[PDB]
Write a protein that binds this ligand. Structure first.
Ligand SMILES: [Zn+2]
Lengths: 233, 244, 246, 247
């Protein structure tokens, strides 16, 4: 494995996933194609927090191979370091290591986030591309003209996962005989849902819609220029 | 004091536009400011838009006419501007920057727009190691206080912590419904009934978010197609003019 | 033998201590409460102490427990008995005495087969009180134990449920346990249903009920206090007589 | 007229202890009422106070609270046909030693410039060995000498009951807690954002239920079961009373 080419729209998904929580490490798998030393990453899977997870990620790559008509497979993994350095921990190197025994040229990506200065008030986000001690691999974030249909849907899947995590917990105390407990659990569950809608779902809705809106602003602007330039011919 | 807030969604989109950018990049910050008694002010950037600086100049002087033509009605929402530079790990304000922040801040300020004391300049850079195995992204929000710029705190609202926690209760603010507020009212809702409201909102939001994916794709293709056409046409007539 | 946790409220514990510091000498009594099972796949046991009652150990002996006397005292409340307690004064030692163990075994056996749940986790609560040389500092120690299957006495974790932390915080959701009066109050007021603001309505109803109980607690306290006085005097009157005949 | 000994009634002891057990995360505080005999402060009444500070060592009773406490004392004086006065204060040490802190000594010393025989009580709660499972609670009765705390001899005097006023004091705790919650929720009423109002209601309902579950319900159970178990002992003693008269 010589280098990695990570698409901007995938990069955006991973960053967005990293910025979802400040108090936990987040994780996901990378999908793409491996040619002559370089790994072109063009897809991404958001994971819960495995055997059943690998299956759904492997299934995705299979479905992408058919739909895009190009070889898609799980090329690597990524996970966030909130309040940490990009430097892969001992566990980061070990997890990356076991993956390489299963697959050479298997790349690991670390997204360090939520690191601000005391009085500086400057933020820093690092992206570390590594394999396994941790050895750095050359990385190049490659331009895309748009956000892929699949990358868009992946962003919305985090919203679904979080809500499903909450429904499963609420289900495990469904018919509590104590009225106080029952009222408590419902209040807890209500706060959790509105917390997901406010922090994750709504911001995603607003981002999608305003991108569409602002695209049209720029679009109409461009065609004003296209007419003014077409005059010269 | 003052505080800038933003979602992971919005922030991720800004970083997305920066990285896919051919050269250096500039644009405007959209959002809204709120005041909370306890008086503290939260400036929330809701979205960004990119614009070629060379499409707003006459020299270093900004053409306030061409600026209005671009922003076009959405000037109200403008609360700042951002500049993205590459490789330079430097995160300091240059002279041209301050001049642009002053110009922009005056243009969008006033009764109709945002407050001049609250206009933000957002600087962002992207560096890379020699091996290019580690990428460093640095950014900061700034404002013009006296006569010397000061960095303002940025809180990225997330599941772990958000600007609203300063108690668990959401404090009411002092004093134009977005698309989400529209969806809420669409349900005509009216506590244990608080749960039913929450679940319905969750489902509505999920369904609405999914119907946007196809719309977002088609807009990205339209704007990306027009970009290509304009870029080539410029080059076309430029090579022609250079010949005659 | 499956994880075990004892739980108690500040209200109940304060009543236990109250009853202890009131007593003239050492004191003994029973623990009343309920055992709950949770599945986490492993099963944990919560044994909650809801209330306590004192009893003169001599009213139950022969140092062998008189089962008929014990049945006679407990009387239908035996299903609620989940353990016993022993309070010792002027000592810092919190070790089970041989007599204590014999009483635990007897009590455990009795309520085990009858109604008081399994013999494995019948409880012995051991409490004591001591003071510094100036008596300016008073020390109160307590511990719960049980007789595990291997014929050993092992201490059990105690959780005093409070506003800062309680046993139900295994996530924030309170899990439903394995199936098998405050609620009677809520039901009588039809409060177990609701957009009424049920939390506030339940709390207020609790407050009102609490207020009507105060005179009842006083009335019963005086009644039992007079009877304790009358019984103690006769016992002394009878005791002195046997002295004279000896 | 020097403080020679404190006699603390067991039912007042129960109220304070119960109060201290309400939370292991914060310190609680209240005032003690009684009468000062020949060198002996006899404490037979208690007032539970509302504490606003979350400061770990900053436990201060306000002047407004002292006055209201004095009013109460004056009422008890009339109600019980006996001299009642504010004799001292108490607070809790969750997860720390019972020994008075620097702030505790400095605060007690101020009270002594107001009243030379003012009593200080500290209840230590929520300490237990991870191995033994054994729990300890200390009760320290102290005054402030030349900058240092010194022990005041303490006796917890027997009461045949839990007095009406001690029972009423216990019932005040949840009321106070609920009122604190109400005040906080009050500051954010009428929120225009639907998501935030739903959030706030969820928060309020959980906090209120929390108080009812940990505090109010248990106290209801404790009162009711005391009544029942007293009657059980009551009937027991009566059966025994017939047999002894036969003797
Ligand atoms: Zn203290």
């Amino acid at each position: 494995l010589q280098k990695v080419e990570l698409q901007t729209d995938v990069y955006m998904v991973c960053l967005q996933h990293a910025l979802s929580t400040e108090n936990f490490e987040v994780m996901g798998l990378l999908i793409g194609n491996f040619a002559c030393g370089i790994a072109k990453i063009s897809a991404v899977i958001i994971l819960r927090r495995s055997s059943e997870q690998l299956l759904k990620a492997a299934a995705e790559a299979e479905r992408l191979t058919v739909e895009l008509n190009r070889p898609m497979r799980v090329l690597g993994w990524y996970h966030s370091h909130p309040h940490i350095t990009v430097c892969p921990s001992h566990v980061d190197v070990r997890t990356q290591a076991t993956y390489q025994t299963m697959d050479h040229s298997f790349v690991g990506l670390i997204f360090s986030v939520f690191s601000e200065g005391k009085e500086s008030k400057e933020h820093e986000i690092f992206l570390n591309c590594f394999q396994s001690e941790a050895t750095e691999i050359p990385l190049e974030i490659v331009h895309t003209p748009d956000i892929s249909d699949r990358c868009l849907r992946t962003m919305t899947d985090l919203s679904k996962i979080l809500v499903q995590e909450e429904e499963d917990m609420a289900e495990a105390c469904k018919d509590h005989p104590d009225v106080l407990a029952s009222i408590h659990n419902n209040a807890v569950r209500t706060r959790a849902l509105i917390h997901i809608t406010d922090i994750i779902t709504k911001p995603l809705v607003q981002t999608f819609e305003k991108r569409i809106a602002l695209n049209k602003l720029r679009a109409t602007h461009l065609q004003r220029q296209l007419q003014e330039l077409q005059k010269m011919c | 004091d003052l505080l800038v807030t933003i979602s992971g969604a919005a922030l991720s989109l800004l970083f997305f536009e920066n990285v896919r950018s051919v050269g250096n990049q500039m644009g405007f910050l959209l959002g809204e400011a709120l005041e909370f008694i306890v008086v503290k002010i939260h400036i929330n950037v809701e979205a960004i838009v990119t614009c070629p600086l060379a499409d707003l100049l006459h020299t270093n002087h900004i053409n306030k006419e061409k600026l209005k033509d671009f922003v076009r009605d959405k000037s109200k929402q403008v609360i700042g501007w951002f500049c993205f530079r590459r490789n330079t790990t430097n995160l300091t304000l240059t002279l041209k920057d301050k001049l642009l922040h002053k110009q922009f801040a005056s243009h969008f300020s006033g009764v109709n727009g945002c407050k001049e004391d609250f206009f933000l300049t957002c600087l962002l850079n992207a560096s890379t190691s020699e091996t290019s195995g580690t990428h460093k992204f640095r950014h900061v929000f700034l404002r013009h206080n006296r006569g010397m710029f000061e960095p303002i705190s940025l809180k990225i609202n997330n599941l772990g912590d958000d600007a609203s926690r300063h108690s668990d209760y959401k404090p009411t603010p002092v004093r134009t419904p977005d698309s989400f507020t529209k969806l809420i009212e669409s349900l005509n809702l009216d506590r244990i009934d608080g749960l039913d409201s929450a679940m319905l909102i969750q489902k509505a939001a999920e369904h609405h978010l999914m119907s946007l994916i196809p719309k977002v794709c088609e807009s990205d293709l339209e704007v990306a197609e027009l970009e290509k056409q304009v870029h080539e046409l410029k080059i076309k007539i430029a090579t022609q003019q250079l010949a005659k």
